[PDB]
Amino acid sequence: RPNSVDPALRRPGRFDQEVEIGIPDVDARFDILTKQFSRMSSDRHVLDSEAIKYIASKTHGYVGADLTALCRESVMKTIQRGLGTDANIDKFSLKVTLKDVESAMVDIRPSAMREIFLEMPKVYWSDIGGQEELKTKMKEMIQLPLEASETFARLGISAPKGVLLYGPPGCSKTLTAKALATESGINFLAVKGPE
Amino acid sequence: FKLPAEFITRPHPSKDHGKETCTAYIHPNVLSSLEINPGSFCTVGKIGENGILVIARAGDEEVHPVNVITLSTTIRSVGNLILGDRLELKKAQVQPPYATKVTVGSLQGYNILECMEEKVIQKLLDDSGVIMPGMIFQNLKTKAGDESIDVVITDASDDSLPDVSQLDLNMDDMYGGLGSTHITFSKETQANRKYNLPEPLSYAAVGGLDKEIESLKSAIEIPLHQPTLFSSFGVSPPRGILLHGPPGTGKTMLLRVVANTSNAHVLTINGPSIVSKYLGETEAALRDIFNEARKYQPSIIFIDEIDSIAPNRANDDSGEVESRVVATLLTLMDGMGAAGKVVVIAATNRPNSVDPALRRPGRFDQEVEIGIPDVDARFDILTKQFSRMSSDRHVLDSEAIKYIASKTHGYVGADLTALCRESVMKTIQRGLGTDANIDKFSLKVTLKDVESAMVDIRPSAMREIFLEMPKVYWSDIGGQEELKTKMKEMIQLPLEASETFARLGISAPKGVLLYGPPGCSKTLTAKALATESGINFLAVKGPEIFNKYVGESERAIREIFRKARSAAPSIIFFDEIDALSPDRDGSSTSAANHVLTSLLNEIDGVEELKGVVIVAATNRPDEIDAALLRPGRLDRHIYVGPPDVNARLEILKKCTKKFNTEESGVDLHELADRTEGYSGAEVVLLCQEAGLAAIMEDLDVAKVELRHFEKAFKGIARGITPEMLSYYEEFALRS
């Protein structure tokens, strides 16, 4: 945490260079899982890539450190399910499956739920709920700046940079931000009032 | 100039025959420093327990390191000398006088060894030294039918002049080839209780957590016994194992059991003695301990009270012991080796107080959870204990054990052991007082002393609780089944469908609210919920958490919530939440707002509490803050109005049960019909005040008259107006 560090250290004159590392997104998690599978080699597992995307999607707030522990506990679950059932049968045939991974992600209980910044929430347009006019308007004002910043700079008008939403406390006021974050693929900041 | 200080035991390598009793592989420098002939006896101090196990000595071949010493598995089992202990050396004592009888016990066998006997005596005493009270050897090869046999030789019939020698070792001079002293095989004797030998803790001694202990044993056995198989995967085996639970569950006992039952090296810490004033001394000691740990491949690490050794840095950064020790232990346990075979067992009373850096999937992914024993576990513990001191000293049938277990539902294994000890000592005291020095075998153990024992000892929680044993039951209360059908399912959801919630992901809202008019049955409903649940109940009320000091309310809230979390899945109840619910109305202080925000965050904020269930009771739910009156938390609302005709009749009959109905002159229905607009508390008080009116005449009476009831009705007021009932109804309509 740079905040706990003395601000004298965080001086541009000396410590100008800064590198920011965030929690992996869906693509980074998929790449990490594929690299781990390649490292542990195909002779010890039978998996397909669609299951890798499914696992990456199912992990929203998971950190990169959690994936290795999940793989290790899945290995333990497979070893136990082989031993205690088949009375010390050969482990080569059992290799790696999906049920152990599912049990591992159920019982892992990660401690990364509490955070001030969530990176790339996953929700698709086939899951959200809203009205057509709101979706069209949000598409219009997300496609205006990111695709016409140079045009606005040439015209010297910039972008409104302000959108206000008000409605019933049911839905279509909070999940819309997550939908926009998932669709646009741009960094998303969520701030809670009482927090 | 070597100056040896402390020594560590080790099993004898290569097996075979060799010495097997007096190996004592020690560098010749230590032999010369002790000024004693190497071809003589040696001693192992082992700190305390005088007797020092005087065994003969032998020299090594100059490669055996000075620090480590070999005591052989036979002596290790004889004296319960576990691996990693500290030992001291001193001059030998006087030579043993002689051996008189020596008698075998035929451990865990049906005896009848004559077919496979083959002159066991030569096999027993083909060795130098050999302390008579202890010989434990492998079966080796005995005729056909292989199998395994062990012998108990603890019992002895001789005495030695010095009281220091605890096991009174004896010399050997008999005859054997490849006749004794009046034979040695007689009876299947167990370990002798006269000398009070330290009984090894068997793996079957602990019970009621068979699934948990089996999972822990497998999780610690698969890395050690299968290191290559796990290393083939390339994911590497973790070293951290977390043990936690309520106090008195016996986690230290199971740690001792697994240490004794494992032949691999075990290491444990002796508490805060490692912590010292010098900053570098503790680091050097930890580094040396870790070095000795991974120097030998099979090693077990035992950690106790990790919460005190490694407190949370955020909670209190007092200094000295701080996050630096957490970091150094994490670095030490991160990379001792690639595959290796190392497991670390950490026991903590409060997992929350532990540093969250320790509680991470990268270092402590595997956790073991221990809860309060249930009826079956307590019954198993009691049966094990009774088998432990044998039926020769007590008589108790299975139904009696089940009844005792059912009566003591809030106890723990430590509580049961203390109950047995207090029952034994009270029985001894009663026998001494009454029977005038009778043999203790005749009186043995009965039921009355044990019942008085659980009556007197009281549960170790030392907090006020109904416990459902001496308090109101379901038969004593007559109400409406409509709310009962709801609450039974509502509180059977979490206790019975935790796996269903985990699999489906629906989980539990954990929010239930009960609103009732003053004088109605609201606390009665809470008591009924607690009774039917059969789980520990915490009696918490609104103003109780409030205090004059600023911030004390938050401390009390955190205390009660971490107590409820560690008190198994239960229900937390607030008697009067109306004292803190309204903040906008009445100009509440900042403390009330802070408490409301804290409880809002605790119920369904940032974290979810699967174990406990939150139930709240308010005198008036219309002034509650809109933040709490939100769907998802405390959403369920039950009107639970005044008792109807049948409930009022049942309540009157229960009150009249102490009286006599035949001579009362009432039909138990006219009174209920007349008393229809009164509150439940007023209805209950009506019977008592009418009884007072009846006894007004001549103190103690046996007859009640209608004039007394009329005077009772005239002299009291309901105190309930239709306006508040209409307001309560409007609360239901508006929601």
Ligand SMILES: Nc1ncnc2c1ncn2[C@@H]1O[C@H](COP(=O)(O)OP(=O)(O)OP(=O)(O)O)[C@@H](O)[C@H]1O
């Ligand atoms: N379930 C049980 N069955 C039989 N005896 C038990 C049980 N639980 C406790 N005991 C007895 O109580 C003693 C206390 O156990 P132990 O020292 O392991 O306690 P603990 O819960 O780990 O707590 P602490 O570390 O404070 O001692 C045991 O040595 C044993 O004699």
Ligand SMILES: Nc1ncnc2c1ncn2[C@@H]1O[C@H](COP(=O)(O)OP(=O)(O)O)[C@@H](O)[C@H]1O
């Ligand atoms: N049938 C009954 N027998 C004995 N006591 C009762 C009975 N019904 C209710 N009570 C008592 O009346 C009290 C009800 O409190 P209640 O009036 O609901 O509080 P509030 O006024 O905050 O709503 C309980 O504490 C309970 O002990």
